[PDB]
Amino acid sequence: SFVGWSTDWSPYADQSIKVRISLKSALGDKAYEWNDNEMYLFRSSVAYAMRQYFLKVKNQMILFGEEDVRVANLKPRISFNFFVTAPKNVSDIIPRTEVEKAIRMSRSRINDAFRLNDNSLEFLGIQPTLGPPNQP
Amino acid sequence: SFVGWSTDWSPYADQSIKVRISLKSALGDKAYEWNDNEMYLFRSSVAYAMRQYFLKVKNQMILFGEEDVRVANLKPRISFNFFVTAPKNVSDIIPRTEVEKAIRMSRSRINDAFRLNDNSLEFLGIQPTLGPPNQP
Amino acid sequence: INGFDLPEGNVTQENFVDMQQRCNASDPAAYAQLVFQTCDINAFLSEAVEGTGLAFIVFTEAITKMPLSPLW
Amino acid sequence: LYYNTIISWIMWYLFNSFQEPLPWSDCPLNENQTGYVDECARSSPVDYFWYRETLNISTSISDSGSIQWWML
Numbered sequence: 153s154f155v156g157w158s159t160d161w162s163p164y165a166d167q168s169i170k171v172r173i174s175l176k177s178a179l180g181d182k183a184y185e186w187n188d189n190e191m192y193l194f195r196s197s198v199a200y201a202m203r204q205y206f207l208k209v210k211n212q213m214i215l216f217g218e219e220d221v222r223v224a225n226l227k228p229r230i231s232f233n234f235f236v237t238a239p240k241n242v243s244d245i246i247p248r249t250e251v252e253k254a255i256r257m258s259r260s261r262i263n264d265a266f267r268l269n270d271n272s273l274e275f276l277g278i279q280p281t282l283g284p285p286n287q288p
Numbered sequence: 289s290f291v292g293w294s295t296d297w298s299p300y301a302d303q304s305i306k307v308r309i310s311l312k313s314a315l316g317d318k319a320y321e322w323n324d325n326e327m328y329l330f331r332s333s334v335a336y337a338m339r340q341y342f343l344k345v346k347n348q349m350i351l352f353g354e355e356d357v358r359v360a361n362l363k364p365r366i367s368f369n370f371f372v373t374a375p376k377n378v379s380d381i382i383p384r385t386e387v388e389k390a391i392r393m394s395r396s397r398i399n400d401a402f403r404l405n406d407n408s409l410e411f412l413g414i415q416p417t418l419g420p421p422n423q424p
Numbered sequence: 425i426n427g428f429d430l431p432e433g434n435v436t437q438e439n440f441v442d443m444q445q446r447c448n449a450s451d452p453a454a455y456a457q458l459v460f461q462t463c464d465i466n467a468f469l470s471e472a473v474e475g476t477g478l479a480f481i482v483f484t485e486a487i488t489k490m491p492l493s494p495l496w
Numbered sequence: 497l498y499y500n501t502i503i504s505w506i507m508w509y510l511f512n513s514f515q516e517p518l519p520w521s522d523c524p525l526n527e528n529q530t531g532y533v534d535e536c537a538r539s540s541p542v543d544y545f546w547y548r549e550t551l552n553i554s555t556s557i558s559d560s561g562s563i564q565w566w567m568l
């Protein structure tokens with residue numbers, strides 16, 4: 153066996169999604185400050201995105217709140233990991249593959265609430281794919 | 289005295305703000321449906337707007353949630369009255385003149401979350417004022 | 425629409441007059457504050473402007489509502 | 497004599513082209529930037545560009561003023 157422990161593994165770490173936000177590149181000037189109120193709006197936007205995915209794909213009505221979005225490892229460069237649990241069941245972590253499908257549906261809506269566009273708000277495992285350029 | 293009663297007066301009626309939303313004029317086609325999940329995002333956007341006004345004007349940290357925004361009289365044309373109370377004090381209605389100053393600060397931010405622009409999202413007592421056209 | 429709470433694309437041009445009487449038969453004393461217009465063509469085609477106004481207040485107003493305004 | 501003043505008015509509207517918001521497309525603000533100019537709101541903006549920003553017209557033929565430099 154292995155004697156010792158590593159201080160990097162976490163019980164919520166394999167279901168986390170890292171978010172990286174670059175405010176002064178999408179706006180530069182006229183760029184707002186990222187205080188704790190902006191983190192409230194992000195947690196309500198993810199909770200909005202989980203509510204729409206469970207209604208339009210799985211036909212369930214699950215009332216996700218902003219307290220079900222658990223944010224860890226907040227850094228200055230605007231970086232955190234998050235994971236979504238059931239509304240009143242802390243043991244029930246939503247798997248990462250269904251949170252990725254929920255954000256992929258509503259990524260155009262989360263981007264507009266913060267005036268970012270798909271490169272200053274990146275989710276590190278979720279990449280934009282669609283769009284064929286058939287002009288003429 | 290007056291014998292009888294009128295079914296229009298309400299104890300929360302003089303502090304309410306009527307919101308009127310016209311979705312098919314700001315978008316037309318590519319216009320989303322207004323279900324109960326969109327009303328959740330509106331209540332979290334107003335709760336975001338009250339959090340920023342009490343921090344940047346009055347230097348208080350008051351944790352407004354989406355349960356403190358009380359929505360009445362929902363109609364098909366997308367119309368409702370709302371009023372904001374204290375976070376855990378239902379008797380403490382925030383006065384209407386300070387909710388009007390809170391929305392006036394963050395009206396550009398609430399508009400971007402729903403892809404509306406200041407005429408398809410009107411607050412009926414809050415009118416846009418600013419902007420001098422000095423081009424040349 | 426701002427007085428009777430109806431959907432958006434509700435009550436277009438094809439259904440104006442029949443939806444005038446559906447509202448006043450639904451609830452009276454809410455139609456009495458409504459201000460409507462009696463606007464109709466052959467009254468918008470029939471202004472008697474002449475001599476300088478056909479180029480400076482009539483023709484140049486219709487240019488601003490075209491696609492490429494500073495070229496026409 | 498007077499047909500060379502109509503061409504004087506025509507080339508005034510030609511100089512005020514070459515800009516995408518045309519000057520006869522919107523009302524100006526007055527002093528406090530809260531409301532429009534009063535006679536631009538009761539009349540039309542195009543009807544306001546002719547009588548007040550081109551001609552600066554008076555109320556009678558008896559009342560006359562200065563030479564109005566731009567027109568000159």
Ligand SMILES: *[C@@H]1O[C@H](CO)[C@@H](O[C@@H]2O[C@H](CO)[C@@H](O)[C@H](O)[C@H]2NC(C)=O)[C@H](O)[C@H]1NC(C)=O
Binds near residue numbers: 243
């Ligand atoms: C909270 O969620 C957990 C799952 O994350 C639920 O646990 C399940 O419970 C049932 C029966 O109790 C078991 O058959 C499952 O195997 C459990 N799941 C797992 C992953 O072990 C739990 O029941 C939920 N709590 C409530 C109150 O619904």
Ligand SMILES: *[C@@H]1O[C@H](CO)[C@@H](O[C@@H]2O[C@H](CO)[C@@H](O)[C@H](O)[C@H]2NC(C)=O)[C@H](O)[C@H]1NC(C)=O
Binds near residue numbers: 379
């Ligand atoms: C909830 O808010 C109300 C005000 O809306 C508070 O009531 C005040 O209470 C103090 C002392 O208890 C009185 O001096 C004030 O006159 C009351 N205000 C009004 C408008 O009557 C109430 O205390 C708050 N509750 C809590 C737990 O803070």
Ligand SMILES: *[C@@H]1O[C@H](CO)[C@@H](O)[C@H](O)[C@H]1NC(C)=O
Binds near residue numbers: 431433
């Ligand atoms: C207008 O509203 C009526 C009432 O339900 C509805 O039957 C009709 O389809 C609506 N019109 C349009 C164009 O949606």
Ligand SMILES: *[C@@H]1O[C@H](CO)[C@@H](O)[C@H](O)[C@H]1NC(C)=O
Binds near residue numbers: 445448449455
């Ligand atoms: C509703 O108002 C119109 C406009 O005057 C009127 O012609 C009509 O008769 C009214 N409806 C009823 C039921 O009186």
Ligand SMILES: *[C@@H]1O[C@H](CO)[C@@H](O)[C@H](O)[C@H]1NC(C)=O
Binds near residue numbers: 527528530
């Ligand atoms: C309009 O401007 C005048 C000065 O030109 C000022 O005295 C007045 O207070 C202003 N009105 C408003 C409503 O700001």
Ligand SMILES: *[C@@H]1O[C@H](CO)[C@@H](O)[C@H](O)[C@H]1NC(C)=O
Binds near residue numbers: 552553554561
């Ligand atoms: C003409 O314009 C000037 C400013 O350009 C103004 O002072 C004057 O009052 C105007 N004439 C009339 C008759 O209003």
